[PDB]
Amino acid sequence: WSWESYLEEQKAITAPVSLFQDSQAVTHNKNGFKLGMKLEGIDPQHPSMYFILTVAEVCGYRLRLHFDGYSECHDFWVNANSPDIHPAGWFEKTGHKLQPPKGYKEEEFSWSQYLRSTRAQAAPKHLFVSQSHSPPPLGFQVGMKLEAVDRMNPSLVCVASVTDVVDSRFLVHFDNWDDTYDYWCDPSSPYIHPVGWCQKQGKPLTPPQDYPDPDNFCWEKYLEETGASAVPTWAFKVRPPHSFLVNMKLEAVDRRNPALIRVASVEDVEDHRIKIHFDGWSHGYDFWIDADHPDIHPAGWCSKTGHPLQPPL
Amino acid sequence: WSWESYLEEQKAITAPVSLFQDSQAVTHNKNGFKLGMKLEGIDPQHPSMYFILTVAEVCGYRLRLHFDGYSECHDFWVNANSPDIHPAGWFEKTGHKLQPPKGYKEEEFSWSQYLRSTRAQAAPKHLFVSQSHSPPPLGFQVGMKLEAVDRMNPSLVCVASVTDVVDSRFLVHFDNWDDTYDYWCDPSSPYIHPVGWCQKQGKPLTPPQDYPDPDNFCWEKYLEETGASAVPTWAFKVRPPHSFLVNMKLEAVDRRNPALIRVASVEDVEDHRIKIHFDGWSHGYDFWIDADHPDIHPAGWCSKTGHPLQPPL
Amino acid sequence: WSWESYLEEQKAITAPVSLFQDSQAVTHNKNGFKLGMKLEGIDPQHPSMYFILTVAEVCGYRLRLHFDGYSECHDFWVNANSPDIHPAGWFEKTGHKLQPPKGYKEEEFSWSQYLRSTRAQAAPKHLFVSQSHSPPPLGFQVGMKLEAVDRMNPSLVCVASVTDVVDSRFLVHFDNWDDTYDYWCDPSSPYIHPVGWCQKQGKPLTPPQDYPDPDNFCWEKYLEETGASAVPTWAFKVRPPHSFLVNMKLEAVDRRNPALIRVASVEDVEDHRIKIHFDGWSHGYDFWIDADHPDIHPAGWCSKTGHPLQPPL
Amino acid sequence: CVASVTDVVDSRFLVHFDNWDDTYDYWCDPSSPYIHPVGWCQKQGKPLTPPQDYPDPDNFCWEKYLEETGASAVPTWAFKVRPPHSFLVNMKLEAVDRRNPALIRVASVEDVEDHRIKIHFDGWSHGYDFWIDADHPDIHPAGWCSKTGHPLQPPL
Amino acid sequence: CVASVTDVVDSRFLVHFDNWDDTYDYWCDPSSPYIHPVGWCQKQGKPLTPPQDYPDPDNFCWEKYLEETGASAVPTWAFKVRPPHSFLVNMKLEAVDRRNPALIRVASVEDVEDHRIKIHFDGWSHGYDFWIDADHPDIHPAGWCSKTGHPLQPPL
The verdict on D126 and D115 lying in the same domain is: yes
CA of A106: which chain B residue's CA is closest? B32
Contact state of D53 with A202 under an 8 Å Cβ cutoff: no
**Do the strands C287-290 and C273-278 form a parallel or antiparallel pair, or are they unpaired?**
antiparallel
Domain count of chain B?
Answer: 3
Kindly provide the residue ranges of all beta strands, DSSP E only, lying in B204-308, ordered along the sequence.
249-253, 261-269, 273-278, 287-290, 296-297
Closest-CA distance, B240 to chain C, in angstroms, reads 35
Q: Closest partner residue to D21 among A202, A215, A284, by Cβ?
A: A202
Contact B267, B287 (CB under 8 A): no
Where a domain ends, among B113, B133, B153?
A: B133
**Do the strands A46-59 and A98-99 form a parallel or antiparallel pair, or are they unpaired?**
parallel
For chain E, the farthest-separated pair of C-alpha atoms sits apart, in whole angstroms, at 58
Q: Say whether residue A99 is in contact with chain B using an 8 A CB cutoff.
A: no
The verdict on D70 and D54 lying in the same domain is: yes
CA of B310: which chain C residue's CA is closest? C245
Dihedral (CA of C291, C292, C295, C297) sign:
positive
Residues constituting chain B: 313
The verdict on E62 and E103 lying in the same domain is: no
**Alpha carbon distance E137, B103 (integer Å):** 63
Dihedral (CA of D34, D37, D43, D48) sign:
positive
Contact state of B306 with A93 under an 8 Å Cβ cutoff: yes
Closest-CA distance, B267 to chain C, in angstroms, reads 20
**What are residue A290's DSSP bridge partners?**
A273
Partners of residue B56 in chain A, C-beta under 8 Å:
141-143
Contact state of A94 with B59 under an 8 Å Cβ cutoff: yes
CB atoms within 10 A of CB D127: 8
The verdict on C194 and C146 lying in the same domain is: yes
Contact present, A and B (at least 3 Cβ pairs less than 8 Å): yes
Hey, which residues 227-286 in chain A have their CB within 8 Å of chain D? 284
CB within 8 Å of B224: residues ≥ 6 apart: none
Q: Report which of D136, D98, D101, D91 is spatially closest to residue D115, judged by C-alpha positions.
A: D136
Q: Exposure of B55 by Cβ count < 10 A (0-12 exposed, 13-18 middle, 19+ buried)?
A: buried
**Alpha carbon distance C286, C312 (integer Å):** 14
Contact B276, B267 (CB under 8 A): yes
Closest-CA distance, D87 to chain A, in angstroms, reads 30
CB atoms within 10 A of CB A253: 23
**Alpha carbon distance A162, A141 (integer Å):** 7
**Alpha carbon distance B164, B142 (integer Å):** 6
Where a domain ends, among A208, A241, A274?
A: A241
**Alpha carbon distance A205, A198 (integer Å):** 6
CA atoms within 13 A on the CB side of C238: 3
Contact state of B313 with C7 under an 8 Å Cβ cutoff: no
**Do the strands C46-59 and C98-99 form a parallel or antiparallel pair, or are they unpaired?**
parallel
Closest-CA distance, E21 to chain A, in angstroms, reads 34
Residues constituting chain C: 313
SS3 E113: coil
**Alpha carbon distance A265, A272 (integer Å):** 16
The verdict on A138 and A210 lying in the same domain is: yes
Partners of residue C12 in chain B, C-beta under 8 Å:
256-257
Resolution (A): 1.9
Contact state of B103 with A228 under an 8 Å Cβ cutoff: no
**Alpha carbon distance D152, C82 (integer Å):** 70
**Alpha carbon distance D11, C307 (integer Å):** 69
Contact present, D and A (at least 3 Cβ pairs less than 8 Å): yes
Structural domain of C248: 1-29+242-313
| Preferred mutation among A128, A134, A141, A171 to probe B, highest tally of B CBs within 10 A | A141
What is the identity of the amino acid at B176? N
The verdict on C227 and C257 lying in the same domain is: no
Q: Report which of A90, A5, A17 is spatially closest to residue A299, judged by C-alpha positions.
A: A17
Contact state of B308 with A93 under an 8 Å Cβ cutoff: no
Q: Say whether residue E45 is in contact with chain A using an 8 A CB cutoff.
A: yes
The verdict on C103 and C161 lying in the same domain is: no
The verdict on B103 and B150 lying in the same domain is: no
Chain D neighbors (3+ CB pairs < 8 Å):
A
Contact present, C and B (at least 3 Cβ pairs less than 8 Å): yes
Contact state of C12 with B256 under an 8 Å Cβ cutoff: yes
What is the identity of the amino acid at C123? A
Q: Say whether residue B144 is in contact with chain A using an 8 A CB cutoff.
A: no
Q: How far apart are the first and last CA of chain D?
A: 41
The verdict on E140 and E75 lying in the same domain is: no
Please report, for the domain that includes residue B1, its CATH number: 2.30.30.140
CB atoms within 10 A of CB B197: 17
Partners of residue D21 in chain A, C-beta under 8 Å:
202
CA of C6: which chain B residue's CA is closest? B256
**Alpha carbon distance C197, C217 (integer Å):** 14
Contact C306, C60 (CB under 8 A): yes
Partners of residue B285 in chain C, C-beta under 8 Å:
none
Partners of residue A113 in chain E, C-beta under 8 Å:
45
Contact C223, C231 (CB under 8 A): no
Q: Exposure of A281 by Cβ count < 10 A (0-12 exposed, 13-18 middle, 19+ buried)?
A: middle
Contact C251, C297 (CB under 8 A): yes
**Alpha carbon distance E108, B135 (integer Å):** 14
| Preferred mutation among B29, B37, B54, B57 to probe A, highest tally of A CBs within 10 A | B57
CA A298 to chain centre: 18
CB within 8 Å of D28: residues ≥ 6 apart: D12, D13, D15, D34, D35
Q: Say whether residue B147 is in contact with chain C using an 8 A CB cutoff.
A: no
Label each residue of chain C as H, E or C: CCHHHHHHHHCCCECCHHHCCHHHHCCCCCCCCCCCCEEEEEECCEEEEEEEEEEEEEECCEEEEEECCCCHHHCEEEECCCCCEECCCHHHHHCCCEECCCCCCCCCCCHHHHHHHHCCCECCHHHCCCCCCCCCCCCCCCCCEEEEECCCCCCCEEEEEEEEEECCEEEEEECCCCHHHCEEECCCCCCEECCCHHHHHCCCEECCCCCCCHHHCCHHHHHHHCCCCECCHHHCCCCCCCCCCCCCEEEEECCCCCCCEEEEEEEEECCCEEEEEECCCCHHHCEEEECCCCCEECCCHHHHHCCCCECCC
CB within 8 Å of C131: residues ≥ 6 apart: C86, C87, C90, C125, C167
Partners of residue E45 in chain A, C-beta under 8 Å:
112-113, 116
CB atoms within 10 A of CB B211: 14
SS3 D15: strand
Q: Say whether residue A10 is in contact with chain B using an 8 A CB cutoff.
A: no
Contact state of B34 with A229 under an 8 Å Cβ cutoff: no
DSSP label at residue E59? G
Q: Say whether residue E47 is in contact with chain A using an 8 A CB cutoff.
A: no
**Alpha carbon distance C39, C91 (integer Å):** 10
Chain A neighbors (3+ CB pairs < 8 Å):
B, D, E
The verdict on D20 and D57 lying in the same domain is: yes
CB atoms within 10 A of CB B166: 21
Contact state of C12 with B259 under an 8 Å Cβ cutoff: no
Residues constituting chain A: 313
Contact A302, A57 (CB under 8 A): no
Q: Say whether residue E43 is in contact with chain A using an 8 A CB cutoff.
A: yes
The verdict on A237 and A152 lying in the same domain is: yes
Contact state of A112 with E45 under an 8 Å Cβ cutoff: yes
Q: Say whether residue B76 is in contact with chain C using an 8 A CB cutoff.
A: no
Partners of residue E43 in chain A, C-beta under 8 Å:
116
Residues constituting chain D: 156
Chain C neighbors (3+ CB pairs < 8 Å):
B
Partners of residue D52 in chain A, C-beta under 8 Å:
204
Q: Closest partner residue to C7 among B256, B281, B313, by Cβ?
A: B256
Q: C-alpha angle with apex E154: E148 to E156, nearest 5 degrees?
A: 155
Where a domain ends, among B241, B266, B299?
A: B241
**Do the strands B98-99 and B46-59 form a parallel or antiparallel pair, or are they unpaired?**
parallel
The verdict on C203 and C221 lying in the same domain is: yes
Contact state of A141 with B72 under an 8 Å Cβ cutoff: yes
Q: Report which of C182, C184, C170 is spatially closest to residue C231, judged by C-alpha positions.
A: C170
SS3 A124: coil
Partners of residue A213 in chain B, C-beta under 8 Å:
none
Alpha helices in E57-156 (DSSP H): 62-68, 144-148
CA of B312: which chain C residue's CA is closest? C243
DSSP label at residue D84? P
CB within 8 Å of B309: residues ≥ 6 apart: B251, B261, B262, B263, B302, B303
Contact state of A204 with D21 under an 8 Å Cβ cutoff: no
Contact B171, B183 (CB under 8 A): yes
SS3 B28: coil
Q: Say whether residue D53 is in contact with chain A using an 8 A CB cutoff.
A: yes
Q: Report which of B185, B180, B154 is spatially closest to residue B169, judged by C-alpha positions.
A: B185
For chains B and C, count residue pairs whose Cβ atoms are closer than 8 Å.
Answer: 18
Alpha helices in E60-129 (DSSP H): 62-68
Closest-CA distance, C247 to chain B, in angstroms, reads 11
Q: Closest partner residue to A227 among B30, B34, B52, by Cβ?
A: B52
